[PDB]
Structures are given as C-alpha cells and as structure tokens.
C-alpha cells in the first residue's frame, strides 16, 4: 500500500 509512516503497521 505505501503508508505515510509507522503508525499504520
């Protein structure tokens, strides 16, 4: 997906 950072792992 390519998420904006670590808070969505």
């Amino acid at each position: 997906k390519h998420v904006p950072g670590g808070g969505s792992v």
Partner: antibody
Amino acid sequence: QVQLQQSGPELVKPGTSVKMPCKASGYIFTDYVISWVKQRTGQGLEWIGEIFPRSGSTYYNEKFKGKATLTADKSSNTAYMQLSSVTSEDSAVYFCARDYYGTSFAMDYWGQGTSVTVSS
Amino acid sequence: DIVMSQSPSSLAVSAGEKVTMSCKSSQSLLNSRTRKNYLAWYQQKPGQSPKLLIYWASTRESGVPDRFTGSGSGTDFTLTISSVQAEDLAVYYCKQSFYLRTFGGGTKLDIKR
C-alpha cells in the same frame, strides 16, 4: 555496499527550476523509499517529502507541497527532486536518504548532499 | 504533523564524562500492533551528512558504538552517550516516523578540554 550518489553544487537563478538526481546502488531500489531532507547553512535538518519508487507514491511535508516534486526512474535506480520557482529560501543542502519503510522506518544511508545556491 | 522538541540545544563535557539529551514529540510515537516507538537518533558531524545511530527508540544500528544508548517511550525520549569521546563532537537530531517524518531542532555537543 549501499550507496546514494548526488550531483555536485549548483547555482540557480531566482524564479527557475532545479532538478537534482540521487543515484542508488547496492540494494533493491524498489524495496525502500527515498526521503529527501533540507539543510540551510548552519541550521537543522528539515524533512521535505518521500517517494516509493516501486509505485511512484509520494508524501510531502505540507510546507513543501508544490515547491518540491519528487520522482523516481526505476530503469536507472535514480530518484529526482525538483524545486520550482526557487527563491533565496531554497538555498540549502539537500540530502537524499534510503528510508527503511515497513520495518525500522529510519534513514540508514545518506547521500553527500547537493548544495544549491539561489542567487543573481 | 507531529512536532518534535530537543533539549538542551547545546552541551559541553570533557572526554570520559556521561551525557544525556532529551527529545519530545507532540504525540505518542508508539504503535500498538508493532509495539515500537517510531523514533530515531542521527549524528551529524561538521562537513558530513547525517548518520543513523538508533531506531525504534532503543535499537542500535550496526557499526555504532555501544556507548550510544537510546531510551524512552511515547512522547519523551533520550539519547545517552556514556564516556564521551573527542570524536563525538556533532549535532544530534531525533526524528519521528510514526506519521510522515519530523526532525527535532538538534542538540549540539561541544567538548571541554
């Protein structure tokens, strides 16, 4: 031996565009994001934005939306940043860094920086 | 859109002394599923591009001496250098990757002699 290669110092005239390359080697280019970071003389590091070369997806720091445009050429394993309509606020050193997306989420290898001086 | 603060902004110690420096985020950097704080520490020497020291708050990156120790959680983090060396002269930055990325203002380390 992961390595990120950036172009030499540049002088650009105010109002113009500058496009600088960051050539990656030693790893799978498409498995890590490339972050870009600005540093004004004597000042701190300021995050600009990132690109995922696999997919071309980008995020930006709000301050750099429509000032910076990040792109990536998978055939050459090279990332580019474009600063548009430059002003003396853009005179700075701009690093690219490999950014371990999905795991560490850190920037583990850096380029040497491209020193941009915007002046007449 | 997480703001980061570092303190103190400047610091002097003699070779061999212990030093600690603090880093604060406007939000928790802790993600419940992974159980990791997305906080890293970087060292920047004069004429040099930044080098990653520590990620996930407290994990040393390979090649980094063990005297550099990262610690803390949520919004309050610490880098400690036990037994500072003359080579450690640098500015130390913290940075958040919980959501986008944000560098702290940096803490400059000067050596007394």
